[PDB]
Amino acid sequence: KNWSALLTAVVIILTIAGNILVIMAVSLEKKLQNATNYFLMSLAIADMLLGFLVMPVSMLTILYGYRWPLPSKLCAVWIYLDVLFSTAKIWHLCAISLDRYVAIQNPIHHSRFNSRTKAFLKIIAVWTISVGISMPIPVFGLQDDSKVFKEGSCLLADDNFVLIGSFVSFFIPLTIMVITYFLTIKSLQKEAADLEDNWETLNDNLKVIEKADNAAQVKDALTKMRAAALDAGSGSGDILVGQIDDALKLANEGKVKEAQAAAEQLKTTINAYIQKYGQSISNEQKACKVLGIVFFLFVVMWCPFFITNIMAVICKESCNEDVIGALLNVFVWIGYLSSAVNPLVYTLFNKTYRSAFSRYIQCQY
Numbered sequence: 455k456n457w458s459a460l461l462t463a464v465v466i467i468l469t470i471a472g473n474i475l476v477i478m479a480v481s482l483e484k485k486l487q488n489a490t491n492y493f494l495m496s497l498a499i500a501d502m503l504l505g506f507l508v509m510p511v512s513m514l515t516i517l518y519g520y521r522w523p524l525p526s527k528l529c530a531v532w533i534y535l536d537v538l539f540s541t542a543k544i545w546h547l548c549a550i551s552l553d554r555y556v557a558i559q560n561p562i563h564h565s566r567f568n569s570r571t572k573a574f575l576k577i578i579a580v581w582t583i584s585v586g587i588s589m590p591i592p593v594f595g596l597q598d599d600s601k602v603f604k605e606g607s608c609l610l611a612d613d614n615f616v617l618i619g620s621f622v623s624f625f626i627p628l629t630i631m632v633i634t635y636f637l638t639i640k641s642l643q644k645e646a647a648d649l650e651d652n653w654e655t656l657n658d659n660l661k662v663i664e665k666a667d668n669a670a671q672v673k674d675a676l677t678k679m680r681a682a683a684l685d686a687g688s689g690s691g692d693i694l695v696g697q698i699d700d701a702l703k704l705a706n707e708g709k710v711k712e713a714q715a716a717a718e719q720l721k722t723t724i725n726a727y728i729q730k731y732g733q734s735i736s737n738e739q740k741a742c743k744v745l746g747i748v749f750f751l752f753v754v755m756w757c758p759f760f761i762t763n764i765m766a767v768i769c770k771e772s773c774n775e776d777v778i779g780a781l782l783n784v785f786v787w788i789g790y791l792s793s794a795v796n797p798l799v800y801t802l803f804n805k806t807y808r809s810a811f812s813r814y815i816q817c818q819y
């Protein structure tokens with residue numbers, strides 16, 4: 455009746471508002487300009503399109519009693535959209551991890567000069583592959599009207615489509631995301647270990663310089679310190695390398711008594727920069743944790759719908775399907791609420807998201 459129509463109607467507007475907020479935050483804040491936030495904005499675009507088009511149609515179908523009120527030729531469109539955006543999201547997320555798994559493994563990943571157009575084309579390519587995956591739904595639904603209509607109700611009825619799409623769209627990106635998340639935490643655990651080794655090497659060679667009577671000892675210690683400071687090529691790694699090379703210039707000239715005071719000043723710079731480099735890896739893994747959270751939430755909230763759809767294929771004879779069919783009618787809306795959940799996490803964890811969204815609240819832009 456109507457006591458559940460209101461419950462399923464708030465989800466649409468919450469999804470719309472939250473994802474429009476996310477789009478505005480990504481497109482407005484100058485601090486979010488990188489590949490990950492561009493992918494998140496594309497994800498928010500997909501969520502906003504899903505909430506603007508598919509969710510209200512599903513709501514009106516619910517209020518009409520799970521009956522299709524639109525022209526019969528548009529049903530194949532509806533499912534297509536419901537596949538086009540979600541398949542994007544599960545592949546957008548799967549993209550991000552992969553990118554963040556590989557774009558950080560090059561030894562100069564902590565550098566500036568991010569490839570904006572490269573990430574833009576990556577997003578376009580992910581959308582293109584999602585379009586290619588989603589094309590069969592309308593292509594084979596326009597020909598056969600019994601593939602998108604299951605005895606008067608507009609939903610996927612082809613068991614082959616259900617199985618393959620569940621494998622292709624849902625399970626494969628989920629497994630890829632899990633494996634890449636594990637490999638990402640394993641890889642990032644090594645970053646914080648090499649940095650500590652560089653810090654220890656710098657401390658050892660600074661101890662060596664402080665107590666010295668030779669001229670080439672300074673050269674050896676400064677060379678070892680030069681190798682340690684190189685690190686992930688931040689660019690201000692080279693400002694520390696440049697200062698070390700300045701002291702190395704003093705040593706190679708010959709004045710030992712002058713190089714030691716310089717290295718003392720560089721020691722203060724070294725401690726400051728390492729506490730800045732090791733802090734950068736902390737954010738590098740915090741973003742990974744937040745993205746893992748959003749992966750988990752999306753997958754878990756879309757799980758029951760796929761579980762029941764897979765159930766409805768193989769055991770079509772040895773499984774009761776009286777109330778189980780009605781379970782899908784709320785599992786689909788759990789999957790829809792997965793769209794609205796993401797901005798909540800963004801406001802819960804990412805500080806810039808919190809500030810921007812609070813700015814837009816309480817009678818303000």
Ligand SMILES: CC(C)COc1ccc(CNC(=O)N(Cc2ccc(F)cc2)C2CCN(C)CC2)cc1
Nearest residue numbers: 536537540541544587615616618619620623624786
């Ligand atoms: C041969 C295939 C390409 C044929 O084409 C297919 C492509 C995809 C699938 C599997 N995808 C869905 O079951 N849905 C979309 C989805 C997509 C991705 C996600 F991560 C989450 C949800 C459901 C469609 C029905 N509505 C009501 C809920 C969502 C089925 C067939």
